[PDB]
Amino acid sequence: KINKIVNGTDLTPHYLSEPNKEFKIYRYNNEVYAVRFENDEPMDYVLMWKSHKDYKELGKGEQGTVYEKTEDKAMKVSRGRHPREFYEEINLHIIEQQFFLKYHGIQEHFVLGLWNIKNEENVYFYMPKINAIPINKKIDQPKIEEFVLALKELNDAGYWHPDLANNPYHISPQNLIATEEMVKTIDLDGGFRYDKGRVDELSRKSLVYGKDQWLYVYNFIYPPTDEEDHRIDWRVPIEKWYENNRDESLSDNPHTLLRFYHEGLISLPKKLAHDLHET
Ligand SMILES: O=P(O)(O)O[C@H]1[C@H](OP(=O)(O)O)[C@@H](OP(=O)(O)O)[C@H](OP(=O)(O)O)[C@@H](OP(=O)(O)O)[C@H]1OP(=O)(O)O
């Protein structure tokens, strides 16, 4: 497919800054791809969305207005005003992140896309359309645990979600989507967050919360209880540890996770505790 895809329709000038030495955008068999080039030769590809070469509203509110351009592709209009080069840089980072997701087989859990900048005064965000389904907790637990373990794999690599769980006291469940087979997360039109070398108080705290983000989401949905089956407040023992272990996260110290887990102060996915216990 590699060589077949690069024989398709070149859409690069509509998304990335021309010319780009590493990434191109191609259409091939009703599929838009992001192709990665090395030696000036194509090496790998990632699928972005399906193509069909007043729209219906899919949503509107805090996160912005999303339309239905086609039945396989959503369109999120931009609210801010920025230069073209601002959305091009975001696209390049999304593509890099998109490859990471592929290499680790977790791409299905995260809805990414690309900002279309061919009209600088009409910039919208294309992404796959997904059919949401009211998420349950009693029966969807395996799917939710599979997403949390995927998000942990993301957090361990330095990436975290910009609007899902900024800290133990903030959660945006609306950005958790359940489908027939799995749980996904949306509101990633800006890509994932990552450290940039800044050391101010806000950026250092954010980097700690970013590595334990997966833990906050899980404990918000499945918090621990006592013998009376009353909700144990997991936030307090976690924050207490943070204030006494500056610039250190719980994921980076697996010995403390299992300790808080056996002590009944935090909840962990089923597979994580077993993989930490045996290994
Ligand atoms: O004529 P183009 O410059 O190549 O633009 C097309 C066009 O979108 P617009 O003309 O509205 O900008 C297609 O829509 P149709 O005319 O076929 O209805 C759309 O294909 P979709 O049907 O899926 O919307 C396609 O977008 P894509 O092929 O990436 O999915 C997009 O090309 P661009 O991606 O460059 O905007």
> Is 116 near ligand 1, meaning CB less than 6 Å away?
yes
Instruction: State the distance from the centre of ligand 1 to the C-alpha of 48, rounded, in angstroms.
Output: 14
Is residue 252 a contact partner of residue 132, using CB atoms and an 8 Å limit?
Answer: no
Instruction: State the distance from the centre of ligand 1 to the C-alpha of 61, rounded, in angstroms.
Output: 26
Terminus-to-terminus CA distance in the chain, angstroms? Answer: 39
> Is 32 near ligand 1, meaning CB less than 6 Å away?
yes
> Is 50 near ligand 1, meaning CB less than 6 Å away?
no
Spans of all domains in the chain: 2-128, 141-278
Residue ID of nearest Cα to ligand 1 atom 2:
53
Distant-in-sequence, close-in-space partners of 215: CB < 8 Å, separation ≥ 6: 152, 238, 250, 251, 257, 266, 268
Strand partners, 74: 68, 127
Q: Over the chain, what HEC string results?
A: CHHHHCCCEECHHHCCCCCCCCEEEEECCCEEEEEEEECCEEEEEEEEEECCCCCEEEECCCCCCEEEEECCEEEEECCCCCCHHHHHHHHHHHHHHHHHHHHCCCHHHECCCEEECCCCCCCEEEEECCCCECCCCCCCHHHHHHHHHHHHHHHHCCCECCCCCCECCECCHHHEEECCCCEEECCCCCCCECCCCCCCHHHHHHHHHHHCHHHHHHHHHCCCECCCCCECCCHHHHHHHHHCCCCCCCCCCHHHHHHHHHCCCCCCCHHHHHHHHHC
Approach to solving = X-ray
Residue ID of nearest Cα to ligand 1 atom 4:
53
Resolution given for this structure, in angstroms: 2.7
